[PDB]
């Protein structure tokens, strides 16, 4: 670590702001160095090639860098980790926040959003139909398991196949192969209301201590008066959510649902949504998170709660609806699945061989990935059917499709108090040109909004891509990060290497199917930044390797600061946070004795 | 007058021949005091 710091810190003078590109590329380098140890000969150094190509491109991107540095610096970065154990290589994920953070800007942040939120996409109708069929099948199977095999209230169409009608009458399960096969019987399906919308699941979601964007009439009140040429409107309306909630003369949860059902959201003339730069992200340009007005924020949080509480539990691949123990156990089982558990015409002559429990065992090969700008690639066509299905389930209409119809005719601005506009007088928001930090008429989604529906659609797409060729997979998906273990039955008389080489063929054959499915749904599975492994997969920024979790001990030690997370300077809270940080470091792979002494 | 009612309820719960400070805590959590505390706990910083 000391050598790594010494090597990288030399780049800051010569390479001013591009150093954070290398600092971000550090983690893919660790993943590649771990990947170069797997048994399969094709997967050795397959991601390291792309990582090194990216580093060479970075190091040959300027005249100062060319005449002061060279591509030989990649060798210096690499040589400090060659011939080292797995734990030492995997430990450098704790070196993420120890290099500082880059200086952000509003125009640079909005340029990428404009670039990747204005493009027109081509979608396949059949693929969406099959994904919807898998969606309905998973819901039906979940309700069956929950209520002991009884189907939920369903009204099949007239053109339903005899197999589906027989399954409904007999109250039997449906496999995804049947769902893809008889996918035309799910086209006109129509659920009935069996879940009652509860508006009092959590009373504290309407009073979160957050900030709200001002109404569109006075949008520039975010910038302080010290940075604006003119003077803002004298109307004194609070932008924080707490005071707005306190000063609400009329309020009942029914009105939020009535607002989102009765068509009011599209007729509101005072709706404003504004981005805000994200802190402590060391990408060369920081991330963005959006905030809306009061009513729309309440509607959004209600929709998220409704979708997550009830429908989310029907899927077994959601990581956001499982407790600590259940999620840990499932992840450990999936990781262990990656290692074999047993090393070793006349007068037809047959010899009795001592078969060992059918002589076939299941082994899996792992594929972990994240999509390119997951939130920006969605469209209304992709999610309209699933929103309608959820509406039918809940007995209401057009609540879960509130995002795109509202956003398609709105303007977004990156609101930073120290990046004011150059206006001399107040100007209506929709009058500024399509440049600077304005996004006009967006199409895609927003980071952190209706993410549960996107997760369900992604799970359905993964299952369709698996069924499309015949392989079997088990997945774990949260937002963008998805880890899929492709399982295959192989003879148990073989050896380790041959079994792994057998499963690698299924993985490389399923990767193209997943790419085609995601391209059909409008997304794009980037070809060179997908982690195919035989032992490891990454989830929640942690690596699972042959059933064991590689340690990250120094990350919980780097946050043992004196005045740590204290509202006011007090000894009790600081000592509590120190003890918590040291306990976390101990349970991440630090020695208990030295951890206690250092604490 | 919520404070007087809360103290009187807690005293009625615990002032017995055997004191069970966990059952009474659960009962108070399920009562009005639980939602009162949940709502009032939204402000956690001195600045706010």
């Amino acid at each position: 670590g000391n050598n790594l710091w010494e090597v990288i810190d030399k780049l800051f003078p010569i390479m001013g702001e591009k150093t954070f590109d290398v600092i971000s590329l550090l983690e893919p380098l660790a993943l590649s160095l771990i990947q170069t140890h797997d048994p399969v000969k094709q997967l050795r150094g397959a991601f390291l090639n792309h990582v090194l190509s990216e580093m060479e491109l970075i190091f040959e991107s300027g005249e100062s860098i060319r005449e002061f540095l060279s591509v030989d610096y990649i060798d210096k970065i690499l040589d400090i980790f060659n011939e080292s154990t797995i734990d030492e290589i995997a430990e450098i994920f704790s070196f993420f926040r120890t290099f500082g953070h880059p200086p952000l800007e509003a125009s640079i942040a909005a340029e990428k959003v404009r670039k990747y939120m204005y493009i027109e996409k081509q979608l396949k109708f059949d693929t969406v139909n099959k994904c919807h069929a898998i969606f309905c099948t998973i819901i039906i199977n979940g309700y069956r398991e929950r209520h002991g095999g009884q189907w939920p209230p369903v009204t099949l169409p007239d053109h339903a196949h005899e197999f589906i009608i027989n399954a409904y009458g007999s109250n039997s399960a449906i496999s995804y192969e049947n769902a893809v096969d008889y996918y035309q019987s799910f086209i006109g399906i129509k659920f009935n209301k069996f879940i009652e919308p509860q508006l009092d699941e959590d009373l504290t979601i309407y009073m979160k201590d957050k900030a709200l964007s001002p109404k569109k009439s006075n949008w520039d009140t975010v910038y302080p008066a010290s940075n604006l040429l003119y003077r803002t409107n004298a109307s004194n309306e609070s932008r924080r959510l707490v005071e707005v909630f306190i000063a609400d003369s009329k309020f009942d949860p029914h009105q939020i649902l009535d607002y989102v059902e009765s068509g009011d959201w599209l007729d509101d003339p005072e709706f404003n949504i504004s981005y805000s730069l994200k802190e402590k992200e060391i990408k060369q340009e920081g991330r963005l998170f959006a905030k809306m007005t009061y009513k729309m924020r309440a509607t959004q949080v209600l929709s998220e709660t409704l979708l997550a509480n009830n429908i989310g539990k029907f899927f077994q691949e959601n990581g956001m609806v499982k407790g600590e123990i259940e999620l840990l156990k499932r992840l450990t089982t999936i990781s262990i699945s990656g290692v074999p558990r047993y090393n070793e015409s006349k007068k037809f002559e047959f010899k009795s061989t001592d078969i060992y429990n059918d002589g076939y065992e299941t082994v899996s090969c792992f594929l972990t990935t994240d999509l390119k700008k997951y939130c920006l690639n969605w469209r209304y066509e992709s999610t309209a059917l699933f929103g309608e299905t959820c509406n039918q389930i809940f007995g209401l209409n057009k609540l879960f499709n509130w995002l795109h119809p509202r956003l398609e005719g709105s303007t977004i601005y990156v609101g930073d108090p120290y990046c004011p506009p150059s206006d001399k007088e107040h100007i209506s928001l929709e009058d500024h040109p399509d440049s600077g930090f304005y996004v006009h008429n967006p199409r895609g989604g927003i980071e952190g909004f209706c993410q549960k529906l996107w997760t369900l659609i992604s799970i359905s797409a993964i299952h369709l891509a698996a069924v499309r060729i015949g392989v079997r997979v088990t997945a774990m998906v949260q937002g963008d990060n998805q880890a899929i273990a492709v399982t295959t039955r192989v003879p148990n008389n073989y050896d380790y290497r041959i079994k792994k080489e057998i499963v690698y063929k299924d993985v490389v054959r399923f990767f193209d199917s997943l790419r085609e499915v995601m391209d059909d749904l409008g997304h794009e599975l980037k070809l060179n930044e997908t982690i195919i492994s035989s032992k490891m997969f990454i989830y929640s920024k942690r690596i699972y390797y042959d059933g064991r979790i590689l340690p990250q001990a120094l990350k919980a030690l780097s946050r043992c600061v004196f005045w740590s997370e204290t509202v006011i300077d007090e000894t009790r809270s600081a000592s509590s946070n120190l003890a918590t940080s040291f306990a976390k470091a101990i349970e991440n792979g630090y020695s208990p004795v030295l951890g206690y002494a250092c604490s | 007058t919520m404070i007087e009612e809360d103290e009187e309820l807690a005293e009625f719960l615990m002032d017995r021949k055997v004191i069970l400070p966990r059952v009474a805590h659960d009962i108070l959590d399920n009562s009005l005091t639980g939602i009162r505390n949940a709502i009032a706990g939204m402000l956690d910083t001195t600045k706010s």
Binding site: H101, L104, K278, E279, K280, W563, D569 | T46, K47
Partner: peptide, 15 residues
């Protein structure tokens, strides 16, 4: 007097 306001001790804002 409201003298319970302390300056922030850790980074919590973008640069």
């Amino acid at each position: 007097v409201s003298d319970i306001l302390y300056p922030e001790c850790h980074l919590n804002s973008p640069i």
